[PDB]
Amino acid sequence: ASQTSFSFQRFNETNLILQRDATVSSKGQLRLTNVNDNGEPTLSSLGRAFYSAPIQIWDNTTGAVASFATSFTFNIDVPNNSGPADGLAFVLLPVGSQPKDKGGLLGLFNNYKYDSNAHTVAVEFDTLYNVHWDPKPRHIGIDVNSIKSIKTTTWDFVKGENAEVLITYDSSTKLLVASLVYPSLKTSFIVSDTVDLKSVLPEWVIVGFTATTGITKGNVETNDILSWSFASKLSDGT
Amino acid sequence: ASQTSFSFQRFNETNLILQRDATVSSKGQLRLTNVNDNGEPTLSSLGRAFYSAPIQIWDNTTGAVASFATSFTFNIDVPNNSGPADGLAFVLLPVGSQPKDKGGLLGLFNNYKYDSNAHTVAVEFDTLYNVHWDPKPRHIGIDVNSIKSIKTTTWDFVKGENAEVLITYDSSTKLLVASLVYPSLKTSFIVSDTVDLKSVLPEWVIVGFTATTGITKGNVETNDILSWSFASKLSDGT
Amino acid sequence: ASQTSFSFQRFNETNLILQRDATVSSKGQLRLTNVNDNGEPTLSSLGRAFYSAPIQIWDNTTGAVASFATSFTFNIDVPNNSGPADGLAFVLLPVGSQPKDKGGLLGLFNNYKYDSNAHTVAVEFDTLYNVHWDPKPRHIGIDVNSIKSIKTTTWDFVKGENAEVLITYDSSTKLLVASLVYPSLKTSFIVSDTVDLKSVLPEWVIVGFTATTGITKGNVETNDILSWSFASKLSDGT
Amino acid sequence: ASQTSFSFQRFNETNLILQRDATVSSKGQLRLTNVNDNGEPTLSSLGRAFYSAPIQIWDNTTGAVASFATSFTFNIDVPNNSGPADGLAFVLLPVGSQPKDKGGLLGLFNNYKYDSNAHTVAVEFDTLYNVHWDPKPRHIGIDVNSIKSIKTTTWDFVKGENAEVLITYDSSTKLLVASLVYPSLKTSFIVSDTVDLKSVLPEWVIVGFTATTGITKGNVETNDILSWSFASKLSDGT
Ligand SMILES: [Ca+2]
Ligand SMILES: [Ca+2]
Ligand SMILES: [Ca+2]
Ligand SMILES: [Ca+2]
Ligand SMILES: [Mn+2]
Ligand SMILES: [Mn+2]
Ligand SMILES: [Mn+2]
Ligand SMILES: [Mn+2]
């Protein structure tokens, strides 16, 4: 009834809305945070990227909510004598949404309080423990209007390893499932919770990614997206 | 490898680039040319509509060309005591492409001469005979860099009836096939001819529609798109 | 809701139901009629190949009818000093159906009268004119329980040239559309009419091909399928 | 190049190969193991069901391996005064494969030893702990030519609840991933390992399910499949 799907092996900036430090390298890689000339990630970075066509997530007339699935391969690497920070997230935001506060707030919030008017659904890949909200181990978290996830799962983060993610949303069950696998480590992690899109997001949203590096020294990482697939389906009724 | 596909039964301006007279009605119909308050098509009208995300048609490195297919339902109506003009088209144009001269040039050209710098591939639905270039009967025609179509086929145009269009392009054979059916009238029409996309179109193009009304009194039509689907695949090689 | 689609560039007998003279050559070609060791087609040959899984076309409980589409590439060649006969057809038949009479009856019917107990929907590619029912020119026809097509269209048959075919059925409008293209000759043909599947076919059917060579010397051809794609969708109401 | 996908919300025997106790109920549920007239599952049952068309997993000429995905929703329920047993499994088996020993071997193996001639890849959902090979808690397992799974993960089995299963296989990484979600409980589980299809399975296989009930009083369950989707893709090279 209304179908959108896109699939990219290599990125080009032509069909993307890049914000802040988010660039497209000559290799075709979506490098969300800054990396200098020597192949080294820099501190205090922030970058967001989006598919240039907004997607309809729901319709107020019909009452219908879209089911969507997305899959992406990312590489987060850390230079020597450093820990990682701060991570990356897949997001659904209002059209023309502008970057927020850097570091641990991932460019999505300005504080660690809940914001009913944030209109933000995100699946986070956290690489840093923030004492005021995060669980102690590194995690995958579902974020609904807060940096303090509604549900998390332990993620055994390993630097330099390609990570293959699948995020699915079934509107009939309201279940958002997110999974990560490391093909070389053969490891796998999954998290799931119910999210009521209709009450959180606007009818039209932009889809894509956001990443930030740490502000303190010794906490930094690359945040590269290597491939992306997205598909949503919204029923209007023949 | 690089897949893109979208399908709409109702239109909204949120995921479209609209140009000149093109509007989306409150019913959810992409109305390309101007219509006054009484539902009457107006003369000298030109409108263009595009999907907000550009599509990649070929790659310079890999040398590959995309295959694409598009289907849509259009309704051309003509008011009483008038004839039809000038027709509408499915178009592939450069990113940021601006409208051209109106009338029987369908907003794609400034004259009826070949123009290698036009970078224009279009499937036209011609409702008015232009002495200088068109065949006499109303026709479906394949346009490559010129309003004089490289091939045409007789289209028995009937006003106010829904026409269902399928346009397919095989890159392996370079064949562009365009067909039209009136599900009520049970009539079908088809035209096919070779097009080399690599030599005519830039790597990245916008996809969508153009339409114009007649400039002389007695020649005018509505140019409405009711539903639209598009899909294109481009191989990179894993 | 109930979706089935397949696509084969190369054929193998493992997933097909072959009948009579139908064979899969060592190249991966579906050779519907018989060909000797010299590479010559034999007279009075009959073959039929189907997909090994039956497909649901309609539901008696919901009343819902499937929308389907099939696309394939066939090669019909005529040896020296001969005419072409009789043709091949894409068919929908009851599960477990047996071959019928050969010749200008394409292995589908016993006679050239209408038969409501036949349960046969077919798109024919008729190369030989049969005085008793066919039109004089070579044609594409839509067969419903009779070899006398309900609708036909002229087909400029050329031997030894690859022919790409698209057959689409839309249950909302009950319209069946059939087109043929010759990629190298740039020629194209189309035929369309409505068909009420709900009254003709059983709920479950088999899909595939049927072919025959002529019974009289100097009237023979090859009937080959080089690739096949099929898709059908059937709503049940979530 | 060679693609097959199918999707069913209701079942019918027409397009499935049923073995032993496997039955398709009036409600349209694939009931793998036997259920008496009260609703009670019976002891020592075995049932297997398969899609009628065989699926090609690899080609010996090109050496190419297929990537496949499958999702199903199953229901396992236990009658009062009993524990569960023995489980159900999604399987890939050689064409014409016949059921093996019942009980904890799930109708795939004759003992609990590795058998290279088994030609059996299966994702199990084990509800009964077997001292000689199983991990203590109820698990999801990846089986390769042996009931002793190459990798497992704890699965918190809850009777009576619909479970949604996704199984993906990427032929480039040789990685198989299997996940289970309980939509109503919001719980979710995942496991992944490498499997070399080319060396284990034959060119063509039948895809589907197998299930067994316990041989000892007090250990029994229903093994119901409520919906099924399967997709595979094998590249010949254009
Ligand atoms: Ca954090
Ligand atoms: Ca004209
Ligand atoms: Ca004939
Ligand atoms: Ca067990
Ligand atoms: Mn966190
Ligand atoms: Mn024209
Ligand atoms: Mn005929
Ligand atoms: Mn086990």
Author numbering:
A (entry chain B), B (entry chain D), C (entry chain C), D (entry chain A): 22 to 259
What do the authors report?
In an attempt to obtain such “snapshots” of biantennary N-glycan, we selected for crystallographic studies two unrelated plant lectins, Calsepa from Calystegia sepium and PHA-E from Phaseolus vulgaris, which show 4- to 5-fold increase in affinity toward bisected biantennary N-glycans compared with control non-bisected glycan. The most populated conformation of bisected N-glycan is termed the ‘back-fold’ conformation, in which the α1–6 arm is flipped back towards the stem region of N-glycan (GlcNAcβ1–4GlcNAc). In summary, our study provides the first atomic structures of a flipped-back conformation of bisected N-glycan bound to two specific lectins. Thus both proteins, PHA-E as well as Calsepa, are specifically ‘back-fold conformer selective’, rather than broad bisecting GlcNAc-selective lectins.
PHA-E is a legume lectin (120 kDa as tetramer) which is widely used for detecting bisected glycans. Unfortunately, electron density was observed for only two sugar residues from one branch, which made it impossible to decipher the conformation of the whole glycan. We have now determined the crystal structure of PHA-E in complex with a longer bisected N-glycan derivative (glycan 2 in Fig. 4A) at 3.0 Å resolution. Eight PHA-E subunits and eight bisected glycan molecules are packed in the asymmetric unit. PHA-E forms a tetramer and each monomer binds to one bisected glycan in its primary binding site. The structure contains eight carbohydrate residues out of ten. The α1–6 branch and bisecting GlcNAc interact with PHA-E, while the α1–3 branch and chitobiose unit are exposed to solvent. The only hydrogen bonds are between two hydroxyl groups, OH3 and OH4 of GlcNAc-7 and the side chain of Asp122 in the loop B region. The putative H2 and H4 hydrogen atoms of GlcNAc-7 can make van der Waals contact with H1, H3 and H5 hydrogen atoms of GlcNAc-5 of the α1–3 branch. Moreover, the nitrogen atom of GlcNAc-5′ in the α1–6 branch is located within hydrogen bond distance of OH3 of GlcNAc-2 in the chitobiose unit. As in the case of Calsepa, the back-fold conformation appears critical for simultaneous recognition of both the α1–6 branch and GlcNAc-7.
